[PDB]
Amino acid sequence: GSHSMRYFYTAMSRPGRGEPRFIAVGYVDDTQFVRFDSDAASPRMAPRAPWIEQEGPEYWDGETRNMKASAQTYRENLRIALRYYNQSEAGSHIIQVMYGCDVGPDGRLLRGHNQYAYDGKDYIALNEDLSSWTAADTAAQITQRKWEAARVAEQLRAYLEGLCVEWLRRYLENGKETLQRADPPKTHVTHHPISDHEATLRCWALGFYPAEITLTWQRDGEDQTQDTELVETRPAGDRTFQKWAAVVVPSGEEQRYTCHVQHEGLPKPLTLRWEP
């Protein structure tokens, strides 16, 4: 199928408590494979998936060098942002960065991404053309002007179309046993009366990978979106994910309701009902 590589950086200032913490994580699809944390005793880019462990010392040394340099740059960026927003040195602030590439089944680039946030709000983003910027406000417009002058977009484009895709393809091959295996959800429906008049039907999906899934309830074949309680998809801790969807139904009407499950690991969408 299609695949993605993403890096996520978080830089968090903490006045009076040392320099800002910098944490980077790297993902292929829904699998984390590297981490870096400036608060570690010995900060290093470190492996978090079995298939990256085979990379040699040049990889780990160069990625560690890059993360250390990035932490210094994002500490500077936090100081710069204070100026651009006329803010005091007393408060804690956060810069976040996401970037990476999406490839199709053929390994061809589908699109790149490179976006930034300040205190949880959009700041600046590289547009899909990988050549122009969208700034959220007049502060980020100052960064935009600086980055236009320095032709930053050209450097990011070269990375996103080149090394990003090439290394994603390498990881997908080295990790094909897991990264290229979809685990379908294990499903069941539970039933719990809530009163003499009503009962809860809960449709469960467990053990699936990747995280993307659709769980829906229908009544007489019509989707029940407004009456369905959906929990966020959640990690089990063994690489897989879990999700459930519940509806409250009139006693005796249970067989009017069907749960529908779509997942990449299923050849055909599933239809489930409560089986008493």
Binding site: E63, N66, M67, T73, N77, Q155
Partner: peptide, 9 residues
């Protein structure tokens, strides 16, 4: 593989 740093804000 991670991206090199770019210019600051």
């Amino acid at each position: 593989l991670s991206s090199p740093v770019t210019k600051s804000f």
